[PDB]
């Protein structure tokens, strides 16, 4: 009896470790004003450096950039050069090390989601002209013509595609740890895509052919990504009105990219099963 939550191994129970206290101060802490004034300490001491080191005031201009406050009695020395180099250091840290450390982890990447998708070699199912016919008679993004269906590459807005790729990358990195193929682990894997797999049958369906399972939405909002170093990821809508994006009329009214990616994943996972059946239903937000 302990609640139980989900994991790449099933439905494990969880807990909390004790606050140790160590933990180096991370990127959030590094601040211009806080170390521009700290860099004044690297200077020597004496009657030449004492009063300039004492009167070193620091202020913030419009665009951050913690500068020195040249009141109308200033005494140009090297101390203000030290303020300069300290603020530089803070800026170059926040512009060079904060990315390239935010981008090395698939659970925090923001601006390099495309490179991550290329690393995992994610190929889409609905975008190739030679898709399997069991993928539906007409996919949500394919319009119809005499020569059968025809697919239309979609150009999502930048923010929506950013959030969608981030979710897909989280799910792919979770799947990379080799889950067991039950329903709890699969749902945990495809959870960042905001969708869940639910069977349609209730009576034990061993004999029953066509083990159908439908996809249901968990929310209509991808958890976004915060490029900053302290805040909350800005959530984005996870759907598209077809008429707004001026797409061919034969497509569905609302198009969900996460639903299609999750469909690809779950059809790939349960392919060896000889009687599977995913049924897709149009979900209006």
């Amino acid at each position: 009896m302990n609640v139980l939550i989900p994991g790449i191994d099933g439905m494990v129970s969880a807990g909390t470790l004790e606050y140790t206290g160590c933990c180096p101060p991370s990127f959030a802490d590094v601040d211009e004003c806080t170390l521009a004034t700290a860099f004044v300490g690297l200077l020597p001491s004496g009657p030449l450096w004492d009063r300039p080191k004492y009167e070193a005031i620091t202020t913030i201009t419009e665009a951050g950039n913690c500068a020195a406050c040249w009141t109308t009695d200033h005494c140009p020395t090297l101390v203000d050069y030290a303020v300069n180099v300290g603020a530089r250091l803070a800026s170059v840290i926040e512009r060079t090390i904060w990315p390239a450390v935010r981008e090395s982890d698939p659970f925090t990447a923001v601006t390099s989601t495309a490179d991550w998708l290329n690393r995992f070699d994610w190929v889409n199912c609905f975008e190739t002209s030679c898709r399997s016919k069991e993928l539906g008679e007409k996919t949500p993004i394919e319009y119809m013509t005499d020569c059968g269906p025809v697919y239309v590459k979609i150009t999502y807005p930048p923010s929506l595609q950013q959030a969608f790729e981030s979710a897909l990358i989280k799910s792919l990195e979770r799947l990379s740890m080799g889950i067991i193929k039950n329903l709890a682990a699969i749902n945990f894997v495809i959870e960042p895509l905001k969708v869940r797999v639910v069977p349609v049958d209730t009576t034990d369906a061993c004999e029953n052919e066509t083990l159908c399972v439908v996809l249901e939405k968990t929310s209509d909002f991808f958890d976004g990504v915060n490029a900053n170093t302290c805040g909350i990821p800005t959530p984005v809508a996870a759907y598209i009105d077809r008429d707004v994006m001026q797409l061919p009329s034969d497509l569905d009214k609302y198009i969900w990219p996460g639903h299609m990616a999750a469909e690809c994943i779950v059809r790939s996972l349960l392919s060896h099963v000889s009687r599977f059946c995913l049924i897709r239903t149009e979900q209006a937000p």
């Binding site: 009896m1 909390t16 470790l17 140790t20 160590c22 933990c23 989280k170």
Partner: protein
């Protein structure tokens, strides 16, 4: 490779050279002049930069990360610190058949207190006996104990206030994990990829509270493998024994139905349990078949040898997988190993009082043939001597 933190003195040499060449036209950096302080300051900036770089890049290694930098980066992948777990066991209550049963029952076992871990039937069964899988209220190893008789905390009308822990084994308790036992079981997890093999089911079913051995089906079983309009196996059945808990190590159907509903999920076939999507199954028990082993010709051996052969036979028969013939050759060997090939030792298998038992036949060679859902349980091993010899003279 070939790109790392420069030597300190090397770094300042490079910065001094760059300042002298690009700014001062090549002039040397005279110590204690303003250019000396400017060069020193810069260095300082560059070394603080490299130090911060080595600090955070370390805070992202699961081997050397903090501890709360390890609880995340592992709760995002689905690996959590395991808490103190509750012990579990089995009880047995009796009363008037048909009495009313509550849900908030509690059992008092010595100093501990237990509660039903499964659903409680609406009324006591008609037979009057009810077995329940209870679990402790407080976690920890103290939930593990050995007490057999406990009392009922809430007096229920028409039910005896004295319950007996089934076997006196309440097993399953443990303590929590530290920031060092969670490192392992984390990255040692990363180097793993579960596969859903027969070993996986056989090791997963052994988790259930107080299961001692899990065996596959027996050679006396047909064992259908295709539960549907399918082309190759999707069914899997086994056999669990509770050796030191239930008599002869066999549990009633009321217990194993719970394991079946947990492992393969109920509804069964959609992977709602730990088992993979689309794999129906069942965890079945068996029924005892009492057998009486007659070891003829042991008394003329050293008492130590007779004791050894008895303790080996009693253990070989107890551990016999269900639905497997107890043959005479397998018993003769237990004697031929310690007594040697110069000693006389015949064995016989008989039914108690030569009575008939369901699912027990005897072959032409004297072996006991057992049908599925039946397991040879030892009644009594007896030593006898009828063939005269010169051992004692």
């Amino acid at each position: 490779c070939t790109i790392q933190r420069p030597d300190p003195q090397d770094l300042r040499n490079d910065i001094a050279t760059r300042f002298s060449t690009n700014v001062l036209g090549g002039a040397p950096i005279i110590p204690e002049s303003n250019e000396f302080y400017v060069v020193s300051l810069e260095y300082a900036m560059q070394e603080e930069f490299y130090a911060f770089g080595e600090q955070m890049w370390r805070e992202r290694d699961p081997r050397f990360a903090c501890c709360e930098n390890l609880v995340k980066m592992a709760a995002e992948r689905g690996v959590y610190p395991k808490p103190a777990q509750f012990a579990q066991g089995y009880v047995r209550m009796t009363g008037t058949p048909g009495s009313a049963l509550n849900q908030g029952l509690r059992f008092q076992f010595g100093n501990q207190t237990y509660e039903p871990a499964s659903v409680v039937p609406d009324q006591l069964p008609a037979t009057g006996i009810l077995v329940l899988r209870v679990s402790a209220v407080n976690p920890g190893p103290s939930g593990n104990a050995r007490v057999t008789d406990g009392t009922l905390v809430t007096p229920v009308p028409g039910i005896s206030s004295a319950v007996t822990a089934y076997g006196g084994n309440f097993c399953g308790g443990s303590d929590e994990e530290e920031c060092e036992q969670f490192r392992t079981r984390y990255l040692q997890r990363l180097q793993y990829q579960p596969r859903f093999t027969v070993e996986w089911l056989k090791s997963k079913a052994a988790e259930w509270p107080c299961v001692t051995d899990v065996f596959d089906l027996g050679p006396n079983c047909c064992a259908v493998n295709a539960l549907g309009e399918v082309v190759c196996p999707n069914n899997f059945e086994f056999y669990v024994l509770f050796r030191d808990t239930f008599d002869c190590g066999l549990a009633p159907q009321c217990v194993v139905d719970e394991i079946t509903d947990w492992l393969f999920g109920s509804p069964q076939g959609l992977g709602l349990g730990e088992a993979e999507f689309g794999i129906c199954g069942k965890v079945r028990t068996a029924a005892p078949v009492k057998l009486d082993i007659i070891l003829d010709g042991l008394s003329c051996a050293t008492p130590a040898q007779s004791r050894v052969v008895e303790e080996r036979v009693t253990d070989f028969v107890n551990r016999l997988p269900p639905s497997t013939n107890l043959t005479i050759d397998q018993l003769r060997f237990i004697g031929l190993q310690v007594l040697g090939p110069s000693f006389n030792f015949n064995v016989a298998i008989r039914s108690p009082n030569d009575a008939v038992q369901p699912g027990l036949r005897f072959t032409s060679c004297g072996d006991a043939e057992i049908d599925c859902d039946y397991k040879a349980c030892l009644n009594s091993v007896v030593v006898i001597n009828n063939n005269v010899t010169t051992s004692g003279c």
